[PDB]
Write a protein that binds this ligand. Structure first.
Ligand SMILES: CC[C@H](C)CN(C[C@@H](O)[C@H](Cc1ccccc1)NC(=O)O[C@H]1CO[C@H]2OCC[C@H]21)S(=O)(=O)c1ccc(CO)cc1
Lengths: 99, 99
């Protein structure tokens, strides 16, 4: 589909048994999801944006469905105010910027 | 153009006769540039990002040519980690997300 940017580009994603609204975010290298207790190995990381850094847990090879499109890759989980689909997964669902 | 997302969508912008590199950022409501001088009236504002809140200077009706596409609108100047072009100007240049 085509998503205009008059409003936030929020779409429905699924991660296991949880559906969430997340931003399709070309400004994010990696995907950052709100706090959730995912299974499996992870490692700590600090990520920075406007206002400073937050601490996140990096989980690898996590399958995420984004508007019905299949993706799988790295997911950072921590106290973000918004779920953010970053470029690592945007490329996998075929997302481009066009003007 | 069509811009894929395997790399950061960094583009050259022209603002006040200066060339700068900025990130096309669909997850940003607002355009936020690193510290610089712009002429005219500005208003103190605060904005929140992933890491908390910052103070910025709000400048209205600033022309920016983004990849050769003209926009005129609100520019916030303050301690962002990188220059970001947000939806307020991405809409002006006809940006959409497509997948
Ligand atoms: C370093 C470049 C950006 C600032 C990076 N950000 C993505 C960005 O899209 C965030 C994504 C975002 C969105 C909402 C809340 C928090 C973060 N937007 C943002 O800060 O926009 C601000 C300017 O306009 C305002 O509208 C939204 C917040 C304000 S981010 O969220 O901080 C971020 C995301 C992912 C990583 C890991 O790769 C690191 C940082």
């Amino acid at each position: 589909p085509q998503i205009t940017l008059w409003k936030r580009p929020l779409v429905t994603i699924r991660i296991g048994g949880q559906l969430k609204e997340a931003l399709l975010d070309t400004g994010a290298d990696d995907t950052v999801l709100e706090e959730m207790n995912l299974p499996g190995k992870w490692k700590p990381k600090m990520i920075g944006g406007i206002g400073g850094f937050i601490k996140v847990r990096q989980y690898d090879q996590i399958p995420i469905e984004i508007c019905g499109h299949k993706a799988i890759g790295t997911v950072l989980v921590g106290p973000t105010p918004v779920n953010i689909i970053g470029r690592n997964l945007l490329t996998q669902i075929g997302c481009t910027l066009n003007f």
